[model samples]
Target: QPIQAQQLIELLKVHYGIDIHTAQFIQGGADTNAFAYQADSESKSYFIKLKYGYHDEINLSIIRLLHDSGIKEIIFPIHTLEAKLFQQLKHFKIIAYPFIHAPNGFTQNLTGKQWKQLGKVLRQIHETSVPISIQQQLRKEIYSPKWREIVRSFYNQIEFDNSDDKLTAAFKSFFNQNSAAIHRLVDTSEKLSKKIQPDLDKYVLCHSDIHAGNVLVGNEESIYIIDWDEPMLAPKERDLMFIGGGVGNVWNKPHEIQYFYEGYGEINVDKTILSYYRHERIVEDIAVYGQDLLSRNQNNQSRLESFKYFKEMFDPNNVVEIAFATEQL
Candidate 1:
């Protein structure tokens, strides 16, 4: 969604008692778009993001709950004039935060200090209990046999519409070429997830998207784990899956994983749930990318990134190595 600063100014005037002097749209998130706002003379600034979804309410609720629980790493959504967590302006939902200047997440080669900070904060977030009221509205994540069902449903629904769009065509051709391997990933994940189902624990508060970029390193060296978009009612492994799981580029090594656990203390790994969540994450990506490619809201860059994961899915040996990291092995 393309953003105009004036829309934010109008909303802020009606909601928060602020006169916006400057508002500018900026790049943020793989799928979400962001804009920033500031008062005329004040040093304080705020961030506004407009994404197409109803779960802004739910994500903001989890952020608020964490803040109330004394988890300071997160930045909660600013309330509007009517005390709404997000201002629903047309098809786009608006959420804001006081602007914070920090690096993307941890540095690529995470230091011992960085690992400890991430570990303690991630543990703190996982430890925060979601309020019953909010929990009632949220759905628990299922790592069940039904994963294959959705996989088939999504793959079956993809129509090979001859689109001139470069991205869309690439998405179609790539998946069509690797159809068999994609199916195998789905089937393997389903069976593996079921095997681990009995060993799993009930759901807890988990920040489902834990790529290091989701965190920020503050000026004073404080750790701010931002981006509460996909908070899920899953076990701790849902979050832990990022650590030492060859996920993104955070904690992918032995010492880094050790240092994280060193600060986080004893965290029981539901090996099966951890494994299931890991594999299903790949499957979920396939599902999401397929829809995005087929939808009108498709992005060229996103379509390209989707294909990278598609390649990984078909490479059975690579995925097995990723899931069976030293932490799990």
Candidate 2:
């Protein structure tokens, strides 16, 4: 658990002035811990996220920008009693929202209507005007080599580490055999970054990590785009790249892609930008998975699952293959 359930409840009451009766730690992604709790009195339940380490409050402002822009398909954080968007308690930061009991796009197949709704939501986000104050703080894509270089370093480290664990051994051997493909991803991403930097002026507001998992489908079948952690002022392709890029192997269907574009309306898709984001996404994943494989003490089953996901990138018709295909085209 990220924070003790009792501690979180106490902190919320003291700082945020909300009374959550019971808090159950729910599974969350790598970056944060989440909980679903019943309100102290009403039948109301809320979702509270406990985030650790570095986090800028800029994301909170971005949510406000979206909500204020009439984008209803978002779940913005509720401000504290002090009117603060976020509150710090010990090592954790707290943000609460009305608990959304819904499966995400990765867990539930989105209907064509949901896909079109997602497209329309994304279009609104892309077309919304961002305030200069928010824009100034938001990260723009200069095509930073941060993740690509991290992957290169991970490969270099794996080459030297003498860990004989089954997972480590498998990873080392796999990376060794696939060294050429891995290097190509890093090299090609850099090349694409260089090429795209000149046209960075054509920036739009983007939920930089809009993969299927970030999309939640509500009980009414309405889709809400959650997880605005790394919103950026970059090419619209930053978001569009995930449509068929197959992050979870779910969004690759041709009909799903068509439905999305149907609601996104007409615009030429830049294969260059799309391909760059695709390659970059995999590079980022490789670095993250490599970090877990090398640094963490994950159980055998967990390690194997991670390894499977890592290798699946190279599967035919998946992200790595699709990225290379887009690059070639």
Candidate 3:
């Protein structure tokens, strides 16, 4: 059953000892495994996040890790409780954090300062290294074959029967049109995976999902990153590429990208690797969007949004320009 407003309020009262007169649900964006709610109060509100059972363990682990890591700017839970009330009444589990007031998220047209702040925060997060065991634990939590492999496996399981011949034929036609580029991408990713294997030991904790929605801007123009759910121990550059590809506005402005990199201590970024990763991200986006459209008939809103913001990153005319701009010394 979907979680309701009164149920969340009651749970907060029981668990955190805070009484909420009313709660309102905020919608859209990923991390739908949990919902956001604002309580009606003068000085404070809480972002109530109910854990999807699959991520309960990871969510708890990340909260502990963040607290222990001494990252002071993070917004996290003030309290936790094992409530049979949520289990009994709502049939769902929950974790809640104090609400933070910030701008909606990153815009395609970010100010130079906002972009620089984002880069600085990300660099700080990346520089705090973790022990091997903790790194391994994080990697296991994210991109685990047990969880994400099934998504790939399901694509293989779409066998056709004679009864559905027409539908199968249409699907096949679509497949044939895109198969070559898809296979090339797979081949390229596998090759790059092998080449980058030697550096796997350098993995650090990263906000694996670093898009705009995960960033919050304040009135002072500072940026705070939220949503640590996709935290992982991976190559640092992989995380950087995700940020660049997902949030970079290549067409209308290049200063934000430059400011971001500059604020990141002017770290050297490999153009070759960045280019490869950008392509890989585009393919991954296509696969995910295509799967959602095929399986759930859901329109690819996020995919469309990504394309609009990052079009110049992949535009043929700007390919050389991006490569030159991102090149390392």
Which candidate wins on lDDT? Answer: 2
How many pairs of residues collide in each model?
1, 0, 0
Candidate 3 lDDT, 1-329, residue by residue in tens: 25578877777777767778888888763544556677754557777655565655664566566667766556756564553213322555665666777754545345677677777767877887666556656653222222223234434534554553443345535445545554555555444544543355565667777766566666655456677776776666656764445343332244456888776778676545555554455456545544543443344445444323333334442322333343421
lDDT of 1 by residue, 94-171 (tens): 676777777765464556877777788788877777778888788777665554666687676556665546667776
lDDT-superior candidate, 2 or 3: 2
Span of 10 residues, lowest total lDDT, candidate 3: 141-150
Question: Relative to the unseen true structure, what is the C-alpha lDDT of residue 241 in candidate 1, on a scale of 0 to 100?
Answer: 77
Model 1, stretches more than 4 Å misplaced? 1-3, 28-41, 79-85, 88-92, 106-109, 144-147, 150-184, 198-201, 294-302, 308-321, 324-329
Each model's lDDT: 0.68, 0.79, 0.56
Tens digit per residue, CA lDDT, model 2, 160-193 = 4555677788887888888899999988888887
Q: Sort the predicted structures by lDDT, highest score first.
A: 2, 1, 3
How displaced is residue 64 in candidate 3, in Å? 3.8
Error of 3 at 257 (Å): 2.5
Q: Which pairs clash inside model 2? A: none
Instruction: Report the error of model 1 at residue 129, Å.
Output: 2.7
Per TM-score, the best of the predicted structures is: 2
